[PDB]
Ligand binder design. Structure first.
Ligand SMILES: [Zn+2]
Ligand SMILES: [Zn+2]
Ligand SMILES: [Zn+2]
Ligand SMILES: [Zn+2]
Ligand SMILES: [Zn+2]
Length: 171
């Protein structure tokens, strides 16, 4: 489906677009990646269009490689999905969704430990990047956006730790 949201198909007015770059598996809705007009030929994501060392084109807000990336204001790269769920992250242009603006992200997002990384053999990565916090008031569980994404814990634009998600009646 889409690398950014949890919708598996596109819509006529918002198609699901597949990157044709070699080795790349990025697929995004037009609206999930800020694509202005849908391409008539092969389409390439910003990473595949990049001429940078591959080791460098990766999200600085989380430890997962690949996925749907845009350039940042500090000369780096970040996931669109990480940008959408860390509250203080912004975009210079919300239509094109780029560059991703990190200058207003506070210390508070960078001094946490991702509990999911800690559980999944990524202890060395748990205190890197930026974390969202569980939406339950009083809960101190913190986690990378993409770690929660893969765990099915993301939901405007918030998430829960596994425990509080388990305590919420699903409707
Ligand atoms: Zn999407
Ligand atoms: Zn690509
Ligand atoms: Zn990320
Ligand atoms: Zn994590
Ligand atoms: Zn919680």
């Amino acid at each position: 489906g889409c690398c950014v949201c949890s919708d598996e198909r596109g819509w006529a007015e918002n198609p699901l677009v597949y990157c044709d770059g070699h080795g790349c598996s990025v697929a995004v809705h037009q609206a999930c990646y800020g694509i202005v007009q849908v391409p008539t030929g092969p389409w390439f994501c910003r990473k595949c269009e990049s001429q940078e060392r591959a080791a460098r084109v990766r999200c600085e807000l989380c430890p997962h490689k690949d996925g749907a990336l845009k350039r940042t204001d500090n000369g780096g790269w970040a996931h669109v999905v990480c940008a959408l769920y860390i509250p203080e992250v912004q975009f210079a242009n919300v239509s094109t969704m780029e560059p991703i603006v990190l200058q207003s992200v506070p210390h508070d997002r960078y001094n946490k430990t991702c509990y999911i990384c800690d559980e999944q053999g990524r202890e060395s990565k748990a205190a890197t990047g930026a974390c969202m916090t569980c939406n339950k008031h009083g809960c101190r569980q913190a986690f990378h956006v993409t770690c929660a994404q893969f765990a099915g814990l993301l939901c405007q634009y918030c998430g829960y730790c596994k425990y509080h998600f388990s305590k919420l009646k699903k409707s």
